[PDB]
Write a protein that binds this ligand. Structure first.
Ligand SMILES: Nc1ncnc2c1ncn2[C@@H]1O[C@H](COP(=O)(O)OP(=O)(O)O)[C@@H](O)[C@H]1O
Ligand SMILES: Nc1ncnc2c1ncn2[C@@H]1O[C@H](COP(=O)(O)OP(=O)(O)O)[C@@H](O)[C@H]1O
Ligand SMILES: [Mg+2]
Ligand SMILES: [Mg+2]
Lengths: 232, 229
């Protein structure tokens, strides 16, 4: 028995270690990309405007920024699961996230809607990762509405856990794309990282919850989150 | 359930491979164009100036990013096969036995007939067992209760064919290749990595996997593996 546990512990250790080394390699990819992004901006600025050199240098800079954001999200995904659990009231966390996105919503003329239920029970979760998830969903919704929209967030008690649903009024998603939407590296945006919903899924998986989506193209979309009241 | 954990770890390694190949593609298409732009700016700029040196620096940086992405890919590259002689009858039986209790409780019938004349192939038993377990679990999920699971093994050419047929719930034909793509799944819970592991192991061995499915009727998955790699 002593050796068998030593064994299972060793296989688990090998997977987490591979994750740690992968995070390091990703951090080292960020360094030449950041160098490339800076040097491509210099060349774009110094190059004669309007020409092919200027266009190519600016496109390459934009691509290097997109690549740094892709690599940061990849690091978030490859990193071993590390959750700082805490008892959190969801109303306060949701309000804080909404206040975090308020300026960008008002700039684009998008309404933030959320009603709080003080009856709502506290959940065992990592508040920073839940923020990173809510913000990713909010950003997706904002990009999709583009202007003149509304975001409705609600929280309710489902069995044991809670369901936070974020509904937008944007372009929606076709049923054909309704499955590749969570697939890594898939995006319909030229300045998009197709890893935001991958990160959302990973974080909600580490929390033992579920992410589901219901969308009608043009009408809008709704992302529903189930998070357990007790992590165990 | 320590088996379930080992399965999950294999799924995570396959996922890391996919993520790495994706970042590599996304990083590599621009790289060549950046290196050319660097070369044009450097030839245009006077020798020794700041634009010249910085252009060489940008080129070297693109080459270094290629080296680092190659490193990530090599790190997630799967270990070579532990090639050993395997009697597939014994393996299929052990695989079904690892599923015996869950199939029994969920009212699932396990049917296999062994051919004594079936040759023993050079393969990795643990990985083949992983492909079999993945196919079986997917099949049980396809039908919670009142189903039958049929496995057949046969010689074919210079190889062997194993077919897993289930009553299940069926998969439409409009989504056939996409079933093998990693992170692809038709259930709310669950990863989309099982058949990704299956395909990775089969292609590692040197064989092929094919699917047949009638909606509402059931699904058949066929594996061809070589006798000597
Ligand atoms: N609220 C939404 N409304 C419409 N489409 C959405 C929404 N959220 C996600 N999507 C779709 O999912 C794809 C993947 O999103 P994600 O993985 O977060 O990356 P990105 O936001 O960079 O595209 C988007 O390109 C888009 O097509
Ligand atoms: N034999 C089958 N019968 C019915 N549906 C299947 C079968 N095999 C795979 N599927 C569907 O395709 C998805 C892809 O399988 P897989 O990648 O293993 O995902 P999972 O880990 O959720 O089982 C499954 O989740 C299931 O929804
Ligand atoms: Mg996004
Ligand atoms: Mg599966």
């Amino acid at each position: 028995s002593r050796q068998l546990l030593q064994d299972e512990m060793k296989r688990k250790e090998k997977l987490v270690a591979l994750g740690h080394l992968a995070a390091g390699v990703a951090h080292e990819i960020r360094n030449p990309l950041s160098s490339i992004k800076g040097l491509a901006k210099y060349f774009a600025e110094r190059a004669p405007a309007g020409g092919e050199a200027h266009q190519l240098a600016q496109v390459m800079a934009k691509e290097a920024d997109r690549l740094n954001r892709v690599v940061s999200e990849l690091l978030e995904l490859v990193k071993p699961t590390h959750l700082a659990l805490q008892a959190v009231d969801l109303n306060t966390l949701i309000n804080h996230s909404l206040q975090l996105v308020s300026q960008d919503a008002n700039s684009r003329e998008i309404q933030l809607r959320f009603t709080a239920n003080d009856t709502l029970p506290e959940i065992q979760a990592d508040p920073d990762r839940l923020t990173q998830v809510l913000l990713n969903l909010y950003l997706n919704a904002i990009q999709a509405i583009g202007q003149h929209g509304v975001i409705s967030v609600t929280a309710s008690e489902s069995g044991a856990g809670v369901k936070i649903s974020v509904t937008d009024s944007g372009k929606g998603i076709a049923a054909d794309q309704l499955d590749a939407i969570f697939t890594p590296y898939f995006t319909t945006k030229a300045e998009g990282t197709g890893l935001g919903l991958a990160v959302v899924h990973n974080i909600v998986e580490q929390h033992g919850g579920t992410i589901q989506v219901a969308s009608q193209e043009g009408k809008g979309s709704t992302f529903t989150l189930w998070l357990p009241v007790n992590i165990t």
